[PDB]
Amino acid sequence: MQGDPEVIEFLNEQLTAELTAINQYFLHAKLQDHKGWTKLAKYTRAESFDEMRHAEVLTDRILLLDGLPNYQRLFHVRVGQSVTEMFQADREVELEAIDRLRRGIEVMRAKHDITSANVFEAILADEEHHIDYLETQLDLIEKLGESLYLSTVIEQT
Amino acid sequence: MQGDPEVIEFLNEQLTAELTAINQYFLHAKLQDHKGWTKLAKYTRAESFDEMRHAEVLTDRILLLDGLPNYQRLFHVRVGQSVTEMFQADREVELEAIDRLRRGIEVMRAKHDITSANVFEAILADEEHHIDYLETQLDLIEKLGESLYLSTVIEQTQPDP
Amino acid sequence: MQGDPEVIEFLNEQLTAELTAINQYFLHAKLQDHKGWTKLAKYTRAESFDEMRHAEVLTDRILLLDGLPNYQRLFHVRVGQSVTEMFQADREVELEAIDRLRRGIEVMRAKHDITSANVFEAILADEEHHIDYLETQLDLIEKLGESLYLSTVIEQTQPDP
Amino acid sequence: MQGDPEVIEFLNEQLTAELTAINQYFLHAKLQDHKGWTKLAKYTRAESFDEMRHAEVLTDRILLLDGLPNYQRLFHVRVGQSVTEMFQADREVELEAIDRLRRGIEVMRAKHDITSANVFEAILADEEHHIDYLETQLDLIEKLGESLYLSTVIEQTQPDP
Amino acid sequence: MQGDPEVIEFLNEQLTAELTAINQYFLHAKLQDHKGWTKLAKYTRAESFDEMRHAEVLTDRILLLDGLPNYQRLFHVRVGQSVTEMFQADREVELEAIDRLRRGIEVMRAKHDITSANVFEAILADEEHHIDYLETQLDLIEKLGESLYLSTVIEQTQPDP
Amino acid sequence: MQGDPEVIEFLNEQLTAELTAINQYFLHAKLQDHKGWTKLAKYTRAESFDEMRHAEVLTDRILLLDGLPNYQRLFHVRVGQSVTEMFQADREVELEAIDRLRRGIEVMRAKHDITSANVFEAILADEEHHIDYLETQLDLIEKLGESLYLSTVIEQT
Amino acid sequence: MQGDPEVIEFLNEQLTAELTAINQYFLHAKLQDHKGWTKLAKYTRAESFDEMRHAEVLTDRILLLDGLPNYQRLFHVRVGQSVTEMFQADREVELEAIDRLRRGIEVMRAKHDITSANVFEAILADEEHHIDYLETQLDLIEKLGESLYLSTVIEQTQPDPS
Ligand SMILES: [Fe+2]
Ligand SMILES: [Fe+2]
Ligand SMILES: [Fe+2]
Ligand SMILES: [Fe+2]
Ligand SMILES: [Fe+2]
Ligand SMILES: [Fe+2]
Ligand SMILES: [Fe+2]
Ligand SMILES: [Fe+2]
Ligand SMILES: [Fe+2]
Ligand SMILES: [Fe+2]
Ligand SMILES: [Fe+2]
Ligand SMILES: [Fe+2]
Ligand SMILES: [Fe+2]
Ligand SMILES: [Fe+2]
């Protein structure tokens, strides 16, 4: 088929965000593992792979609509140094996704591309779950302090 | 059969208390899980299911006595915000249960409804065990502080799915 | 995050409806089991547990939106005596759910809370399935009569336990 | 190869009859399942799939004879509302099949298309079995009445899915 | 319940389209199998069974809305003779489906029948996937030619049993 | 028992055709395997063994009717050289069977030897299936060409 | 510890090349699967994941040397439309890899960071294996033609399943 160019622009924009999220989450995961934050890195890594699944779902639909998936562009990768900064950086990415998905759902349904809208709806629910994890961990960091929090994730390995 | 009206009232009062405890314990479990207090939420949730079995036992006995089990009323559900408040609130529920069940057992045996008394006797021992856990946790919180205590119950997961 | 207050009001209203439905369906199941309506009670009981799943899904989303899930309020629990009344009562509850869910999906989508809308959309499909079961059972009762209908659900079992 | 045009006309006519029967039996099964006539719907559904096997066998033979299988035409689908009407409608379809198959076997054998005749002979035996089931169920409905008969096929299940 | 007449009409129109697609896809699968296009027939046949599940889902929803599912009407079944014509014909069916479903979803949501809309939404995604395969195969045929393309789907078997 | 001599003549004539078909299909199968037409030879060989089953069924009935099965006579074995010729030769054999079975069914049923008629009816359906395979392959050869068709059946072995 | 800045610059440049290759190979695999070139897409995809291992090995070493792995920069992603173009594009990426790794190995050994050199030596052999496959397929396409070659990789499935 051939999609609506504005719908394809939306898919490619979210695709750029996922590729950005993949790099950010993967690098944070490697930073946390290297700092010895074993249990936390394991979670961040899996979040990275989930963004890859989002990228592949978007790519599939872009191709079905006869668009060219954008694998060249990246947004600015946020790199945190402390555990608090890493969660805050990753939360910022998911907050931009939310808005980048909400607006896309309204256009896609207005232009009747319901299947593309549902791709965004599913990603939106996932991103909302992840931000909930990030904000829950940040609340934990505020209550426990960074050291006590970090103490729960390190592993003699 | 047809129960003694005062006995059925005692059973229905405890049933109201269980329905309240189910909601209170379930919401505390969900609140703790949402705050990332993983291992603690698992325990609070299981306690919620205990009160559900208590509710079903009470309901069974009321029907056998030909009464109408009360599924309409709730007492005031106490919602804590900190971990201490949650344990204190749930302790309050179990304190009233312990008082209500003991008074009911004496009346039920006085009116010769021995089987109804034994239902309360079984629930009472359960409620006493639960209050013992709550008071034990509160003692741990006082000794360790909320943060160190919470540190032992968190797990990399923290979900709302 | 923080939801739109009207959206949370919708979620909390439906949560109130589910908690009512849980109590109504569970009591009907216990009433039916006590009357010896064995196979029918098994189904009504399972319907109760489905409403618990609806309640838990709603509770999760309310917490994610930083609201306070309402475990204090119940609507009026409708209690039937005959099989026909029980089905009619449970049908009335699902009719009110279906109306409120349609209203919420439109508001949630207009305010862009698509994830909350989809939570309602899934519950709505379940409630529509359930009302369809109730109306089909009601049609059977009209065709067979209560006695002949009840004869298909009786089983050699005990009342209490 | 290339068949006798009249033989292919016979095969295509029966294929039209089967495609009609598939639709009629499947819709009756879905109608019966929706009314809660569970065990009866399972049987009617299986009857539908048998007619699909008849359709596929006929289609294969038409292609071997280099004809064009007719998937465009349907006869009038008879839709009953009561159980009695549904059985009467499905019986009417099998009566017309049985008459046409006997006519085709004689023509096919006279024109020496023995393999086509045997395709009809096998379908005829199946349709005769099916009409025998319908008439036996109809006799039961007359003896028991619709309500008592329906009571033997009801089951604790859902309408849709 | 009782559906909106326009919603039930949309559902029945798509149901007519599925019944047409089932016949069209099944006959193409049988025609390809009879021509020895073994691996391709297996795929076309499976697509036929997808449309049957679509038909059953639509039928289920129409009955829940108290409509009469239309098992009487077929649209024009498009029959190709070459491999290209068959893919082009089946693409045409999916083009109309995609148009019909999108218009129906907007109306169904406008009339607040959200569950009916979601049935169409699920079918739409399936139809879009199928058209994507058809257009992909057509591109392969244009690049390779019919003969080379066919060479990849033939197997020593070529049956009509 | 004792069969009708005309019925036994029919059985023995079809038996001669099967013994002929066995040799023809077997030799074609060996020719195709020797030319490296691996997947095709496997099919032709199995068709050969099916004609053997026909021969045995005919022999059994001839013996039941107290006739002497003819294992001495053969019709002319057609040997093709190209793939097209082999299919055309085997199709010719099955076309003669069809006619040799149709006429036999009418006589056997007229003379009331229904069981012998049914032996022919079963063979007729099998032969009709086989000719359908032959004509389908020939149509494939016409559409693809001999080389492209042969390319689908060869095996490094 | 702390590596030599020039070594870390070499590692980060190869890391950029790997991130470029992951995207390039993954998109080629998705393009080929979407065109129905089933068996070939399977191969290109696996090549994408192998480049992911290279990135993870490179990231690990950069972190050990207390550098900041660069996950921000990409080289130009080459997207071909025909099969030949896709193979030619992927060969171009590997050709730049071979040159960069050889200079890095010599510098890394001269500066006594032998472990970093061996990381490059291992990747170097993998890239050479991959280039040999690409040139072999390109030779097959030249002998067979694009159409005949493509016929050997297609399978009845050809979707965009998600
Ligand atoms: Fe994502
Ligand atoms: Fe209790
Ligand atoms: Fe309850
Ligand atoms: Fe519910
Ligand atoms: Fe609950
Ligand atoms: Fe059908
Ligand atoms: Fe039939
Ligand atoms: Fe069929
Ligand atoms: Fe469909
Ligand atoms: Fe032999
Ligand atoms: Fe034979
Ligand atoms: Fe990636
Ligand atoms: Fe690499
Ligand atoms: Fe990656």
- CATH class for domain D1-161? mainly alpha
Using a CB-CB cut-off of 8 Å, the residues of chain E touching C101 are 114
Kindly give the distance from the C-alpha atom of residue F134 to the centroid of ligand 11, in angstroms, as a whole number.
Answer: 14
| Best CA proximity match to E26, nearest among D10, D64, D13, D72 | D72
Residue in the structure block whose two tokens are 């035996």: D125
Integer angstrom CA distances of residue G98 from E16, E67, G52, G81: 61, 69, 17, 25
User: Which residue, among B154, B157, B160, would best test binding to A if mutated, counting the most A CBs under 10 Å from its CB?
Assistant: B154
Distance between alpha carbon E50 and the CA centroid of its chain, in Å?
7
Residue in the structure block whose two tokens are 């006739």: F67
G1-162 to CATH, choices 1.20.1260.10, 1.10.390.10, 3.40.50.720, 1.10.3720.10: 1.20.1260.10
Q: Which residues contact A119 (CB under 8 A, 6 or more apart)?
A: A11, A57, A58, A61
Which residue in B27, B63, B161 is closest to C30 by CB distance? B63
* Residue D34 near chain C (CB below 8 Å): yes
Q: How many CB atoms lie under 10 A from the CB of residue A103?
A: 14
Q: Which residues contact G103 (CB under 8 A, 6 or more apart)?
A: G10
Contact between E60 and D161 using a beta-carbon 8 Å cutoff: yes
Residue in the structure block whose two tokens are 């943060």: B147
Distance from C-alpha of D105 to C-alpha of F109, rounded to nearest angstrom: 15
Distance from C-alpha of C133 to C-alpha of C47, rounded to nearest angstrom: 11
| Best CA proximity match to D114, nearest among F130, F105, G23 | F105
Contact between F133 and E34 using a beta-carbon 8 Å cutoff: no
Search chain B and give the residue with CA nearest C24: B71
Helix axes G114-144, G83-110, angle to 10 degrees: 160
HEC sequence for chain G: CCCCHHHHHHHHHHHHHHHHHHHHHHHHHHHHHHCCCHHHHHHHHHHHHHHHHHHHHHHHHHHHCCCCCCCCCCCCCCCCCCHHHHHHHHHHHHHHHHHHHHHHHHHHHHCCCHHHHHHHHHHHHHHHHHHHHHHHHHHHHHHHCHHHHHHCCCCCCCCCCC
Using a CB-CB cut-off of 8 Å, the residues of chain B touching C19 are 23
CATH superfamily of F1-157: Ferritin, core subunit, four-helix bundle (1.20.1260.10)
Q: How many CB atoms lie under 10 A from the CB of residue F33?
A: 16
Data resolution in angstroms: 2.6
Distance from C-alpha of E138 to C-alpha of E143, rounded to nearest angstrom: 9
DSSP string spanning D126-157? Answer: HHHHHHHHHHHHHHHHHHH-HHHHHHTT--S-
SS3 state of residue D104:
helix
| Best CA proximity match to G76, nearest among D108, A71, A40, D94 | A71
Distance between first and last Cα of chain G: 44
Using a CB-CB cut-off of 8 Å, the residues of chain A touching G31 are 63
SS3 state of residue A72:
coil
Distance from C-alpha of C157 to C-alpha of D15, rounded to nearest angstrom: 52
Q: How many CB atoms lie under 10 A from the CB of residue D32?
A: 23
Distance from C-alpha of B136 to C-alpha of G127, rounded to nearest angstrom: 62
Buried b (16+ CB within 10 A) or exposed e, C96-116: ebbebbbebbbbbbeebbbbb
Using a CB-CB cut-off of 8 Å, the residues of chain E touching C129 are 64
Instruction: Note the maximum CA span of chain E.
Output: 55
| Best CA proximity match to B137, nearest among B1, B39, B15, B6 | B39
Tokens of A57: 């779902």
Distance from C-alpha of B112 to C-alpha of B160, rounded to nearest angstrom: 49
Buried b (16+ CB within 10 A) or exposed e, C31-50: bbbbbbbbebbbbbbebbeb
Amino acid type, D113: D
Contact between C121 and E112 using a beta-carbon 8 Å cutoff: no
Experimental technique, in short, is X-ray
Q: How many CB atoms lie under 10 A from the CB of residue A150?
A: 19
Contact between E158 and F133 using a beta-carbon 8 Å cutoff: yes
Q: Which helix (H) or strand (E) holds D59?
A: helix D38-64
Search chain B and give the residue with CA nearest A42: B156
Tokens of F99: 């006619």
Residue in the structure block whose two tokens are 């297996």: E42
Kindly give the distance from the C-alpha atom of residue E114 to the centroid of ligand 4, in angstroms, as a whole number.
Answer: 16
List all residues of chain G from 142 to 161 with a beta carbon under 8 Å from chain E.
146-148, 150-151, 154, 156-161
Minimal C-alpha gap between A155 and chain C (Å)? 30
> Phi and psi of A114, rounded to 5°?
-65, -40
* Residue E112 near chain C (CB below 8 Å): yes
Cβ pair B130, C30 in contact under 8 A = no
**What torsion do the CA atoms of D44, D47, D48, D53 make, to the nearest 10 degrees?**
170
Q: Which burial class, exposed, middle or buried, applies to A39 when counting CB atoms under 10 A from its CB (0-12, 13-18, 19+)?
A: middle
Q: Which burial class, exposed, middle or buried, applies to F142 when counting CB atoms under 10 A from its CB (0-12, 13-18, 19+)?
A: exposed
* Residue A39 near chain B (CB below 8 Å): yes
Ligand in nearest proximity to the CA of E19? 6
Ligand in nearest proximity to the CA of A131? 1
Q: How many CB atoms lie under 10 A from the CB of residue D41?
A: 21
Contacts 24+ apart (CB under 8 A), F153-157: F153/E156, F153/F37, F153/F38, F153/F39, F153/F40, F154/F36, F154/F37, F154/F38, F154/F39, F155/F36, F155/F38, F155/F39, F157/F38
| Best CA proximity match to B54, nearest among B101, B7, B6 | B101
Q: Which residues contact F35 (CB under 8 A, 6 or more apart)?
A: none
Buried b (16+ CB within 10 A) or exposed e, E54-88: bbbbbbbbbbbbebebbbbebbebbbbeebeebbe
E130 is in an annotated binding site: yes
| Best CA proximity match to C3, nearest among C65, C63, C70, C60 | C65
Q: Which residues contact B49 (CB under 8 A, 6 or more apart)?
A: none
Domain positions in chain F: 1-157
Cβ pair C27, C79 in contact under 8 A = yes
SS3 state of residue B157:
coil
